[PDB]
Design a protein around this ligand. Structure first.
Ligand SMILES: Nc1nc2c(ncn2[C@@H]2O[C@H](COP(=O)(O)OP(=O)(O)OP(=O)(O)O)[C@@H](O)[C@H]2O)c(=O)[nH]1
Ligand SMILES: Nc1nc2c(ncn2[C@@H]2O[C@H](COP(=O)(O)OP(=O)(O)O)[C@@H](O)[C@H]2O)c(=O)[nH]1
Ligand SMILES: [Mg+2]
Lengths: 428, 47, 56, 440, 50, 50, 50, 47, 41, 36, 117
């Protein structure tokens, strides 16, 4: 009745989606064989949000797995849940992007976008009433960043009234995984500004900090990092698939968190994270949820909120809680920290409560926060970009794919204008 | 002569793969899978 | 006492050749960069003098 | 779906490819006869050999390799050796008379004869390639066949395939030892003709590997097989993402984008971090920090160029084995704080990473120890301008008197090509200078 | 007299100390920007650092 | 000497014949899975352990 | 799986003379059949009280 | 090797270390001109 | 009060790192947080 | 062998060592079927 | 000949999907529509009439053998980004030096991209 079509592009997108679909499957009670083995009727009443009906008590995801070279989806398909995807949803070519945005946007992704658009139309027009879209990708690569933005540009032309979410992974400040990554991040951000309704920015070393300081995991694999992104993905749409005292879907959050259309970059967070020996030292209560939720070492982007002002903050609570406690705590958070909240918005907090918690947990909450402190990631990307573009570092790998030299000038101008627009609301 | 201690470990995991169905413990949460509207037309609601 | 290594002899015939890759915005920036790199010859290690600062 | 065609040309190419293909067979399950020992699955079995091996109908895997030489005595050892049944007979091309340390024989007169046969065999091998990525060419800068005919191969492949990726595995001339007199002439000529027909050019010396084998490994008086096994380990760690699972996969197209900043500087240096003997491995923990720091040691480099004499421009790091990405993050964060490691201002990132869970394999008879972690670092540094200047001087001393040019001028190559090859690398000399100065 | 030029390394240390003093001036200027907006005004101390 | 050579060759060769029979048996044992036939119940005999 | 374990134990009993061996696979298959017997006993008792 | 069973939470995944073979398989390939998606038979390492 | 504490820290840091046998790598690790400078235009 | 099963059955080793006498010592599912 | 286009199923018949990794011909994406009927412009044995214009290109194709392709072949990629104006002019003049290789059937297909300063 309100369906979501899920897209994943590139290695980062496919590997995050392989964990996200497993997490949704455990939430709704789906075995690796594809059937349903739930123990409550509430896990079946809203299964059409993410699953398609098939005969024999079997359900299939709405995923469209996209990659330029299928080397990642081969390892995805061999996992414990890799055989539940429909075979026709895998779209692939023979040659990879090679960590090149221009290749994946003009050379290789142009020959592959027709089949992806066909699969998307097939899976989107078979729905009763489409709610929106979800895309997981990265801004440091060439497939998830190059063609992952081409998919948005072609989707928004056809369906210009649907929610377009992007759970992107943004570059880190300390250590780079790609050398040409500032170019890819700049161009993908320039595409993302004018083509998305919400954007959730996730920094890898923020997740490493979470797994090191809060979870005390000596050897966290990339699956452990992807688990947190999956958990913060499934919290945003938990009111579509489960009832609540106070309901809020993607559109309600998009209304409440976006005061101006260009300001839609959010910084996520997942509340009940407890280490392996200290579960007896803390109780699942709303004060001890909101104490961790607003914390700086609990966020998923590497920029503490003390560098700026919160504009709008949301918290989609899950579980059976007294919302008088929720209201009192979210008032106390605003009243105690007067200088870190904007003045011309009387209430900066949007609150949703859903009854059904994650399995094994009494209660949970997913932080989404529109803070002005997102601008320092943008400034880092811009100055790393103009360090290279001043001397034209790697420009021969982009213009040789047919690009124009004013592309990077235009993208840097748009990014700088976005930073200045964020600075406008820093000082009222 | 060795050729086997390189492709294969001479070891086994001391634990089996942890399954994700401790169903008697998942339902040990207070008011397991019970919504808020079930109190309307019942006896004694508290949380 | 062993003296430092020399700069290796080349023909004057191939000393008038210019570069092929222009990696600076303007010519003034080129002049400023080369007129800032040519004071630290005696304090940079290696032949052609494009290395570290030789330290204390 | 990830096939790459290895093109071994010259005695160095064939003797390197022998160790490379022994390790390729041993890493998978393929016997020296081209057959698996058994079919343990009923109908399954991994198809991971498709990167290197092409399966026939019944049970036999054939390598995707062309062995080219102009002398029969190097290929004939493979033809009558242990891996004779493994190789297809028409994949081993052989001339009657060799180039004999002359670029002109390999480029104009003798090497222009067998070029068609190698091109048709390359086309036939690329016909079965479902998902072909690029070519890998193994040669040496000092020989006649490996300098002339490899350049002619690049010459033909650019015409016949366009922008297809072609990585090099060159053997650079050493700064003090050599096994030839006319080696600088071949080096200048085959660098000049392939300054642009190569997307990347990984080079290793021979004296530097001698120093590593003497110092890091416990062995003295080594032979060429000990160097060839190390080069095979390097080329296996480069292509390990195509066949094994990886947290971060590294395609062959990623190297040219993350290691070649400018259209002529495409000469990075390779190094393998935990190259240590068994008894040294017994006393040493080989964590990610130790083997990340050991890559940047000047003594551990496989090319005889001091990195302290130049500036790092781009670094590509490939990890293998029991490797946590958290420790990779911490170790590369530690290195950027160092002052003895200096980078260039216009590349603040300077790193491309890749992690593969497959541990490196132990070939019997090799002196390397079984390790759980390994790094193959490919670093493009400005410090190579010492090597180009020394090669410039060595060409210069002979070209002042025009020694040995009667062997070249009398075989279809004019004198003027020396004058423009030397002028082009003399341009490249200050091309390196322009990218080493900081903007203020 | 060649061994008399062993004080050539002695001025390398002094050049290192001069470069460190430049770095310390950079650190001092960049730390003074952490003052509040009313405090950060033109001052004789900034001219001294320049 | 020729007779001694032939005796040792045939002894090693009987060993190899036994090895190839056992290899065939073990390779047939490896090709067994839950979703296959050619597999039954057998009584718990003491010869399964001897 | 009990069928597969019993068949693997049966086929390996027909190996030739010397290579009738106490491989670790034999201990693994004995533990296989013991573990499956214990699991079956638990499931059957619990079916009875269901 | 007992099997325990835990709830699925963001901080619970215990990797194996007795695993050397990380071979992958070409379950996604091509044909005469067509994208074949064959069924998976083996996992990671040929198991 | 905040301004006074900041200037006292500057004086104390300058006095600490001036004392010789201080190498560079213990001198760049004191004030090291990456603060990007605001957009060019 | 490694372990000591309580009904010790050494007869097949005795036969095999009777035929091939270079076999090394045997130093350290309980009933038969009627077919045996 | 003439390589036409299966309109929906051009993707299976693409030059790279048929395991041909070399340079290939471009296909025809549109077909002109003409009315009427054709005149006869030849006679028996295939000879063109004297009143019909001919092509100045030589018959038996334009194929460059190994011993006829030029020494020191031009670039294949040939991107001009971050180059000296004189040096990029030299590289372009190297491209335009041999027009016989450019118009060959198995000829070079350079991609002159970028702009020097
Ligand atoms: N690493 C390594 N280098 C080798 C090997 N064999 C030869 N070389 C190098 O190759 C150079 C000479 O070229 P060769 O490979 O011997 O012969 P070629 O390349 O076929 O040239 P021609 O003999 O003239 O046909 C020498 O300088 C060696 O450094 C080898 O087995 N391993
Ligand atoms: N944070 C996080 N990043 C990932 C993960 N997998 C891949 N990435 C990121 O993806 C980037 C590489 O881009 P990639 O998607 O592999 O290139 P593409 O396949 O051409 O789109 C790197 O910066 C990685 O940090 C993951 O599981 N978590
Ligand atoms: Mg030779």
């Amino acid at each position: 009745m309100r369906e979501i079509v899920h897209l994943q592009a590139g290695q980062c997108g496919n590997q995050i989606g392989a964990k996200f679909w497993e997490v949704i499957s455990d939430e709704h009670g789906i075995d690796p064989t594809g059937t349903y083995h739930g123990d409550s009727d509430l896990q079946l009443e809203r299964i059409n949000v993410y699953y398609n009906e098939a005969t024999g008590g079997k359900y299939v995801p709405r995923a469209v797995l996209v990659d330029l070279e299928p080397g990642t989806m081969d390892s995805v398909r061999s996992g414990p849940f890799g055989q539940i995807f429909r075979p026709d949803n895998f779209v692939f070519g023979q040659s990879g992007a090679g960590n090149n945005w221009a290749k994946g946007h003009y050379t290789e992704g142009a020959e592959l976008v027709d089949s992806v658009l066909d699969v998307v139309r097939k899976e989107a027009e078979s729905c009763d009433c489409l709610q929106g879209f979800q895309l997981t990708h990265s801004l440091g690569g060439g497939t998830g960043s190059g063609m992952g933005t081409l998919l948005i540009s072609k989707i928004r032309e056809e369906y210009p009234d649907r929610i377009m979410n992007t759970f992107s992974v943004v570059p880190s400040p300390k250590v780079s995984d790609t050398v040409v990554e500032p170019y890819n991040a700049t161009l993908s951000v320039h595409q993302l500004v004018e083509n998305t309704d919400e954007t959730y920015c996730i920094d890898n070393e923020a997740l490493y900090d979470i797994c090191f300081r809060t979870l005390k995991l000596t050897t966290p694999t990339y699956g452990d990092l992807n688990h947190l992104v999956s958990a913060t993905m499934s919290g945003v749409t938990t009111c579509l698939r489960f009832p609540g005292q106070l309901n809020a879907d993607l559109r309600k959050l998009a209304v409440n968190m976006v005061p101006f259309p260009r300001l839609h970059f959010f910084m996520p967070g997942f509340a009940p994270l407890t280490s392996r020996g200290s579960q007896q030292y803390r109780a699942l209560t709303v004060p001890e949820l909101t104490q961790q939720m607003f914390d700086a070492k609990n966020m998923m982007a590497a920029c503490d909120p003390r560098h700026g002002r919160y504009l709008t903050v949301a918290a989609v609570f899950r579980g059976r809680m007294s919302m008088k406690e929720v209201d009192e705590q979210m008032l106390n958070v605003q009243n105690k920290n007067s200088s870190y909240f904007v003045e011309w918005i009387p209430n900066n907090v949007k609150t949703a409560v859903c009854d059904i918690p994650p399995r094994g947990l009494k209660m949970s909450a997913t932080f989404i926060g529109n803070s002005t402190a997102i601008q320092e990631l943008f400034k880092r990307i811009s100055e790393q970009f103009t360090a290279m573009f001043r001397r034209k570092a790697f420009l021969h790998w982009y213009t040789g794919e047919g690009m124009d030299e004013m592309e990077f000038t235009e993208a840097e101008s748009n990014m700088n204008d976005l930073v200045s627009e964020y600075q406008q609301y820093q000082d009222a | 002569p060795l050729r086997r201690l390189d492709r294969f470990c001479p070891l086994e995991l001391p634990w089996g793969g942890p399954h994700w169905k401790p169903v008697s413990g998942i339902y040990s949460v207070p008011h397991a899978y019970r919504t808020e509207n079930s109190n309307y037309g019942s006896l004694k609601p508290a949380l | 006492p062993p003296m430092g290594l020399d700069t290796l002899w080349h023909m004057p015939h191939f000393q008038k050749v210019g570069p092929h890759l222009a990696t600076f915005p303007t010519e003034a920036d080129r002049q400023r960069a080369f007129k800032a790199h040519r004071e630290e010859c005696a304090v940079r290690q290696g032949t052609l003098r494009m290395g570290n600062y030789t330290h204390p | 779906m990830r096939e790459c065609i290895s093109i071994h040309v010259g005695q160095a190419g064939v003797q390197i490819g022998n160790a490379c293909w022994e390790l390729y067979c041993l890493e998978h399950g393929i016997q020296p006869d081209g057959q698996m020992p058994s079919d343990k699955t009923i109908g399954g079995g991994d198809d991971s050999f498709n990167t290197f091996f092409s399966e026939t109908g019944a049970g036999k895997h054939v390598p995707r390799a062309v062995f080219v030489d102009l002398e029969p005595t190097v290929v004939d050892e493979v033809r009558t050796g242990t891996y004779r049944q493994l190789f297809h007979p028409e994949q081993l091309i052989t001339g009657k008379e060799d180039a004999a340390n002359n670029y002109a024989r390999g480029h104009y007169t003798i090497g222009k004869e067998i070029v068609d046969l190698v091109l048709d065999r390359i086309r036939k091998l690329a016909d079965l390639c479902t998902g072909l990525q690029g070519f890998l060419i193994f040669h040496s800068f000092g020989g006649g066949t490996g300098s002339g005919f490899a350049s002619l191969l690049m010459e033909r492949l650019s015409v016949d395939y366009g922008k297809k990726s072609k990585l090099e595995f060159a053997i650079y001339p050493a700064p003090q030892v050599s096994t030839a007199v006319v080696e600088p002439y071949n080096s200048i000529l085959t660098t000049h003709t392939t300054l642009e027909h190569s997307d990347c050019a990984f080079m290793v010396d021979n004296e530097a590997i001698y120093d590593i084998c003497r110092r890091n490994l416990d062995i003295e008086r080594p032979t060429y097989t000990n160097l060839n096994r190390l080069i095979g380990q390097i080329v296996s760690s480069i292509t390990a993402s195509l066949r094994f699972d990886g947290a971060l996969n590294v395609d062959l197209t990623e190297f040219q984008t993350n290691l070649v900043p400018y259209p002529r500087i495409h000469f990075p240096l390779a190094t393998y971090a935990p190259v240590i003997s068994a008894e040294k491995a017994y006393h040493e923990q080989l964590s990610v920090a130790e083997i990340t720091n050991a890559c940047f040691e000047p003594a551990n480099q496989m090319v005889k160029c001091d990195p302290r004499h130049g500036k790092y421009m781009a670094c590509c790091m490939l990890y293998r084995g029991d490797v946590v990405p958290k420790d990779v993050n911490a170790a590369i964060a530690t290195i950027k704080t160092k002052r003895t490691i200096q980078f260039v201002d216009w590349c603040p990132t300077g790193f491309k990473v890749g992690i593969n869970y497959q541990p490196p394999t132990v070939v019997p008879g090799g002196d390397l120890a079984k390790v759980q972690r390994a790094v193959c670092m490919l670093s493009n540094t400005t410090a190579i301008a010492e090597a180009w200047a020394r090669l410039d001087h060595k060409l210069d001393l002979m070209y002042a008197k025009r020694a040995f040019v009667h062997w070249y001028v009398g075989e279809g190559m004019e004198e003027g090509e020396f004058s423009e090859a030397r002028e082009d690398l003399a341009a490249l000399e200050k091309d390196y200078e322009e990218v080493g100065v900081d903007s203020v | 007299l060649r061994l008399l030029q062993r004080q050539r390394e002695a001025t390398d240390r002094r050049l290192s100390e001069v470069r460190k003093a430049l770095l310390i001036n950079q650190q001092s200027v960049k730390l003074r920007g952490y003052r509040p907006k009313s405090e950060t005004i033109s001052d004789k101390a900034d001219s001294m650092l320049t | 000497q020729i007779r001694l050579n032939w005796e040792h060759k045939e002894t090693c060769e009987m060993d190899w014949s036994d090895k190839v029979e056992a290899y065939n048996i073990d390779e047939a044992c490896c090709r067994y899975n839950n979703q296959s036939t050619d597999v039954q119940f057998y009584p718990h005999s003491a010869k399964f352990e001897e | 799986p009990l069928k597969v374990a019993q068949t693997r134990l049966y086929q390996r009993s027909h190996r030739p003379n010397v290579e009738l061996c106490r491989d670790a696979a034999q201990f693994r298959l004995a533990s296989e059949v013991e573990e499956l017997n214990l699991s079956l006993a638990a499931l059957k008792e619990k079916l009875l009280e269901a | 090797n007992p099997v325990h069973g835990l709830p699925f939470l963001p901080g619970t995944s215990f990797k194996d270390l007795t695993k050397t073979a990380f071979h992958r398989s070409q379950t996604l390939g091509y044909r005469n001109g067509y994208a074949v998606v064959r069924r998976p038979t083996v996992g990671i390492g040929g198991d | 009060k905040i301004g006074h504490n900041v200037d006292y820290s500057v004086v104390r840091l300058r006095l600490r790192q001036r004392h010789p046998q201080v190498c560079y790598e213990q001198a760049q690790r004191l004030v090291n947080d990456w603060d990007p400078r605001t957009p060019p235009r | 062998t490694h372990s000591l099963s309580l009904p010790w059955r050494p007869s097949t080793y005795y036969k095999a060592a009777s035929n091939w006498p270079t076999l090394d010592p045997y130093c350290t599912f309980t009933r038969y079927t009627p077919d045996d | 000949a003439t390589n036409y286009s299966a309109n929906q199923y051009e993707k299976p018949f693409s030059p790279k999907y048929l395991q041909n990794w070399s340079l290939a011909k471009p296909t025809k994406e549109r077909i002109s529509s003409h009315e009427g009927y054709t005149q006869i412009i030849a006679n028996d044995r295939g000879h063109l009439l004297p009143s019909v214009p001919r092509s100045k290109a030589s018959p038996w194709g334009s194929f460059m053998g190994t011993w006829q392709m030029p020494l020191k072949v031009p670039p294949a990629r040939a991107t001009l980004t971050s180059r000296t104006a004189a040096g990029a002019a030299s590289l372009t003049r190297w491209i335009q030096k041999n027009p016989d290789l450019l118009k060959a059937s198995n000829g070079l297909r350079p991609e002159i991209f970028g702009k020097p300063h």
